[PDB]
Amino acid sequence: GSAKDVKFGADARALMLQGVDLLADAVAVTMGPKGRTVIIEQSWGSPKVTKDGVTVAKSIDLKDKYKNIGAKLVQDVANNTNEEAGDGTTTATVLARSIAKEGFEKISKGANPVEIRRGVMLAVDAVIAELKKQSKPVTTPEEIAQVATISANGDKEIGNIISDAMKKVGRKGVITVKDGKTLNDELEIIEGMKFDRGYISPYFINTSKGQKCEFQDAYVLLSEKKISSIQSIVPALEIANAHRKPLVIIAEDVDGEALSTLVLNRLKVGLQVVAVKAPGFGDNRKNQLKDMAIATGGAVFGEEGLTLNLEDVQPHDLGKVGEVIVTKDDAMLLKGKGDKAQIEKRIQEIIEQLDVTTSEYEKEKLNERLAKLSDGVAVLKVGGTSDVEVNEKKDRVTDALNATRAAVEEGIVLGGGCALLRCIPALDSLTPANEDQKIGIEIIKRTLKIPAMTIAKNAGVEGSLIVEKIMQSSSEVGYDAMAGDFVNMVEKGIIDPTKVVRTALLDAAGVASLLTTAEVVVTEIPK
Amino acid sequence: GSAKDVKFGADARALMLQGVDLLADAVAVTMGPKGRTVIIEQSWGSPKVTKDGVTVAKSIDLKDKYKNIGAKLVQDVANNTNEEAGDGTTTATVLARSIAKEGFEKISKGANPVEIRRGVMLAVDAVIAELKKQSKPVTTPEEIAQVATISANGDKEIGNIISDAMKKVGRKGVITVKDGKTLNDELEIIEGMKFDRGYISPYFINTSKGQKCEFQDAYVLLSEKKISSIQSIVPALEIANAHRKPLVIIAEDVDGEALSTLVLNRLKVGLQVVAVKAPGFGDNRKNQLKDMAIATGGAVFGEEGLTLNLEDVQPHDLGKVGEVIVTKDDAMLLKGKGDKAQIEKRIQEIIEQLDVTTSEYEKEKLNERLAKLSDGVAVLKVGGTSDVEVNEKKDRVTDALNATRAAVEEGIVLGGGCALLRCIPALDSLTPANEDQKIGIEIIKRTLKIPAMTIAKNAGVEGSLIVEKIMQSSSEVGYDAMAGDFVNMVEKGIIDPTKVVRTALLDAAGVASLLTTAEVVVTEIPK
Amino acid sequence: MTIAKNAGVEGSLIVEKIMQSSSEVGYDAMAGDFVNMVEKGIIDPTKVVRTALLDAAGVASLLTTAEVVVTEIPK
């Protein structure tokens, strides 16, 4: 209903291209090992310093609405590349700018831009097939460290710590990046089963040094219900006292009367016992209690289906652990004595539940729970001096984690834009259906040299000469922009994940070739 | 109430024609196989790229209120054409602009524009009769694929997938378009009775690979009331246990004591049973449960009228399914053992209820029930790399389904604007009553060349020469604007639904010939 | 580079191939081919080339010594 302004043809296309060019010019200065950073003003507090392409793209919106349409479309390109790959957003931005520019240049009266877009998509399918032919799988941890080093802007300590994390918790294990309070990066490996619920009352401490509850070879009592009565807690304590064995009660809550009994027996006679709340929220509580029961070889009490009561407790429905550590804010069970076969069947149940979930929230819960059963999790604390430096480093650590996961998934290709340069002869063998598809294939052929050219231009050299020498060279040779030398790139560890490259190219090509079919732009009149 | 500006005669008509011309110029760039796209800025997020004429029309409003009146009238033309036919909105827009322009040019002191409008409508009736004479019914699935391909801007894959859907679920079956998460379009055929209610308890899972409940040759217990007591659930379980047969309960809800009994008997002794909530939200829920009762051969318990009781359940009161899958979010019943004549009677009851339906929302529910009872539904998932591409493609897929349904309903004619071109000799034989009616007939006669001329102009050639060559050629010969050649259009599959053509012409003609009768325009003074 | 740029090709690649070529080989920008320039008659007067270089170098290298610019305030 609002009044609109309608622009036609080449003027509207040039305004949208101005928006695309401004955003991609801001993004392109961050590409490669000699890329620079972008400072983005925040409404609150300190500005943000970043080398991340989608972060730069998302922070830019233009007053002119025709320019802002092109800026929003390349924002979509960078966001989609970040969503499905976690890396390569700058490459996708510069590819999208190249395709938009070449498509806008090739529009005349006789051109059919929809068929040009068909030719563009056919060329991208050919390039993706050639990239999959060129890809090789990751086999060594050295390749892992090289991928993580390249994706972290040449930082070898980040690559080494990510490779160590994947050596310790597995290549598909749970790795989590968070803030460090020190100057240096730290890797913490959380083994066993550790959850973020501490002890319930501050009267179960037997070790002064950490103000912590310390037991070894202890019974574990699992409860899906709150333990508030005498009759629901006394027989388990009788079993624990008749065996001279410590007891760890993991329940929904132990409050009031059972808590009073526990603290009275702990303080007066010296009964070894501790009470921890049940981690989780809702069905995750029941799932994690069940998993602790399989891992310790115990049984969950007070449940919906089997309905085991806390009055008839046996010595065989209490789990056994080799060590338990309880602190103020967390607890951890170590060396659970559960049946190993039941642990493997529960793990397979977790994997088959992963295979049918797609909400990306309970998927992370299932990954957490699988990691707790199998090998533990890894936490990378990112060190630094200030919050701005820590955040800038965490962007690259997240990029390197995502790229390493991608390289474990789909393999590796040559870095430095060389993998798209070696796909040009695949395009040279295509037979286009008509002239418009030939135009589209040639657009993609010219666009394939753009990442290597941008990396070389950011290094202060003539990018066209670098790309020409790479093309004239043997297939293993490419430009090391950091060293400024033509090297064997696999031997020097300058490699990229295949999935990142194909994702960036496909995401750029679809949106940019849709944009180049436009003839009329309708905007709202700014009030 | 507010202050008004009043304009008279030719100046007001010129301003209204400026509004009409602006909207039609924006819409007309999208017409034909060489049409281009329009980018519409959205208030939120990404802009919308479209080739749909009514979408372009509805997005344009003008600050000048005199121009905005003409813009809203051609918006009405496009919206009415989309509501009746679902396609041909660009054709309707350009026809309306042509009629408005010719009628505005033919207004003098002695002219009677109301009688000119009467001549216009008489000419349109003659053209519609000639179109119905020229129409031929659709007999082959090849014609289905050709219609869907033409309506989807030459996309042969969309035509093939729509033809496959109409092969599998019928030409009058239920076909729904939704988003795909992949690159490519997918066709999913849902057969039998599948509804979006999963299991009530996770403990019913007996197949871990899909985390789902799988049963073969199972009893079905259907209740219109909630099952919550022991006595309402025990006898059916006793019948299921005595017959050595799985039980599937479909109820309003299963909670409380009955759910506890179900999960206890499932976990302890391994009783084959599963409980599912009933689909629907009222009378539709009762109708769907009744439909499942006829489909499986069972009876609905706890209904309002017959009032069957869950205490006295007979084995013949339970339906029989050959197979059933219950997942987390859906359930599906396969090979029900209901009486075929009862299923037929229910089907005719549903068809006659459709015949007496006047809401178009209950029509969807009745068609869904008919599809679940007879042939199943088809889901077209539209693929793409981004939301803007997916939305642009879904516009064309929806257009192709609407055009294919229209072609099934009322037949086909020559595409490319040639069907209206061949109706000119029908206008050449009319005898007008007076000079004003002769003017109106001649307006329609000039207007009948506009769609072919616009299609040829978008292809970059001289439209008038193309139209003259078509009119001088044989009746089967038209212009392939994609190939740029004069061809046999039926043989080349360039065809249109007759309903779309006549709807576009009638909807354009009524509004534009009403608009050309205006002498005074009253607008509000802009505040 | 400027002659190659005006011909619609990439000037740096052209200059690189000329510098990698034999001393008689240069780029016919009208035909878009690497040719023998004396045989094809693409030749220049020596005086014109040296005059253009000297007259550009003197003024431009004097201009690049400037720290302060004084202009009149526009009325």
Ligand SMILES: Nc1ncnc2c1ncn2[C@@H]1O[C@H](COP(=O)(O)OP(=O)(O)OP(=O)(O)O)[C@@H](O)[C@H]1O
């Ligand atoms: N020493 C190097 N020599 C040549 N190319 C290199 C070198 N180090 C990294 N590269 C290349 O630089 C690219 C990485 O650039 P950068 O990380 O700045 O952008 P991106 O991955 O496209 O985007 P973003 O990280 O912002 O999401 C990859 O193609 C990588 O192979």
Ligand SMILES: Nc1ncnc2c1ncn2[C@@H]1O[C@H](COP(=O)(O)OP(=O)(O)OP(=O)(O)O)[C@@H](O)[C@H]1O
């Ligand atoms: N190859 C072709 N040669 C000639 N005419 C063609 C060809 N393909 C399609 N057409 C014609 O183009 C017209 C379809 O144009 P288009 O779908 O852009 O507009 P529309 O149906 O009027 O409106 P909308 O789809 O926006 O609601 C039909 O008349 C169809 O017969």
Ligand SMILES: [K+]
């Ligand atoms: K970057």
Ligand SMILES: [K+]
């Ligand atoms: K159209």
Ligand SMILES: [Mg+2]
């Ligand atoms: Mg990167």
Ligand SMILES: [Mg+2]
């Ligand atoms: Mg159409």
